[PDB]
Amino acid sequence: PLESQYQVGPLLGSGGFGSVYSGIRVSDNLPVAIKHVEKDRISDWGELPNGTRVPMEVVLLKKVSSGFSGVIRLLDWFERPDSFVLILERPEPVQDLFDFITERGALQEELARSFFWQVLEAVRHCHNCGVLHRDIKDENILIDLNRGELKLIDFGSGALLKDTVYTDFDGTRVYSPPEWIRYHRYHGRSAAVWSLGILLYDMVCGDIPFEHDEEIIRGQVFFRQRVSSECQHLIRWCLALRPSDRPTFEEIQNHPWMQDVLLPQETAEIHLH
């Protein structure tokens, strides 16, 4: 009955996603995050299997909820006069990948391999559920520091997965593909693989490879840190200029650099605790 089933924590950060808040679901003292999203600022809409009009964010999240801890799970959603209030699980303690890199700098390849692997598994889950994230980047990845588990968040720029061309994009540009920049046209998976190459470079070098349109289009990768040849191969393959020259997810996960990954919990005991 009502939204009174949630005590309200402090703010965690504002942006284009909305206003997210720490929370403590009082039904069972469970830790949740409450995201408020104004009706006015939502452009993309959709509908639930039952035929109700909601923000696409809700539609996407519902499709990706299962026992798999790799995506932020949606627990509930409410509809306020001018806003959709969302209830989401909140790991604790937690820190997003952006802040983790800001503090720690470039990651050791072993760490980057565990992290990248977990993101690959999470993206695969979304796709298998018919969802395309469209904003894969370090700010949208949460790290459960106790369990060494990564979690994909903010599907507010996402879309249903399809095999035809996408000609709309409202995700992060420096992560967007050269086909989006030159033609305003892309396909789901290839574009997703491009952002993952950006994200892998980010983890192993401490920052993203391109900042300007021309650099994206030119696709020339310069390594500013020592990075193994195998890792540079994978990155450069993900950042192939022609979409068809990019690796599939299977090809990424079968790459030599991705072999012998650490399990989440091993990852934490060695690199987080």
Ligand SMILES: Nc1ncnc2c1ncn2[C@@H]1O[C@H](COP(=O)(O)O)[C@@H](O)[C@H]1O
């Ligand atoms: N602790 C958290 N901090 C920020 N966002 C969170 C947190 N836990 C879950 N989320 C969800 O992740 C998204 C935040 O968007 P962004 O900061 O752009 O990655 C929203 O959809 C939130 O509801």
